[PDB]
C-alpha cells in the first residue's frame, strides 16, 4: 500500500527550529549532515520552514544567499518565507 511515512514526525523540533536552520545546511559540512542525518527521516514537518529550507540544499539561490553559517538564514530569512521562496520569483 500507500507508502507514506510517519507524519507529524519532529521536523527540526520547534526548539531547535531556528537552531537547525544554523547547523542544518550547508553551516559546515560535517555538523549539518549530522541533523539531516536524523532529520529528512524524521521530519513530517518542513513544508513549513521548508517553504524556504529547500535552500538547505539549493546552493546556487542566484538573488540573495551568503556563504557560510549565516547562508542558511540568509537564504531561508533573506527573503521572508511567504512567496518570495514560493514558485514565485521572476516577472
Known amino acids: 500500500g500507500s507508502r507514506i511515512?510517519?507524519?507529524?514526525?519532529?521536523?527540526?523540533?520547534?526548539?531547535?527550529?531556528?537552531?537547525?536552520?544554523?547547523?542544518?545546511?550547508?553551516?559546515?559540512?560535517?555538523?549539518?549532515?549530522?541533523?539531516?542525518?536524523?532529520?529528512?527521516q524524521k521530519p513530517g514537518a518542513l513544508r513549513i520552514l521548508n517553504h524556504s529550507l529547500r535552500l538547505a540544499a539549493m546552493t546556487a539561490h542566484g538573488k540573495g544567499e551568503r556563504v557560510n553559517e549565516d547562508y542558511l538564514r540568509q537564504?531561508?530569512?533573506?527573503?521572508?518565507?511567504?512567496?518570495?521562496?514560493?514558485?514565485?520569483?521572476?516577472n
Open 5 to 40: 511515512a510517519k507524519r507529524t514526525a519532529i521536523n527540526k523540533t520547534k526548539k531547535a527550529d531556528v537552531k537547525a536552520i544554523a547547523d542544518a545546511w550547508q553551516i559546515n559540512g560535517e555538523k549539518e549532515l549530522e541533523l539531516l542525518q536524523q532529520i529528512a
Open 75 to 90: 537564504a531561508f530569512r533573506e527573503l521572508d518565507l511567504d512567496v518570495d521562496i514560493s514558485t514565485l520569483l521572476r
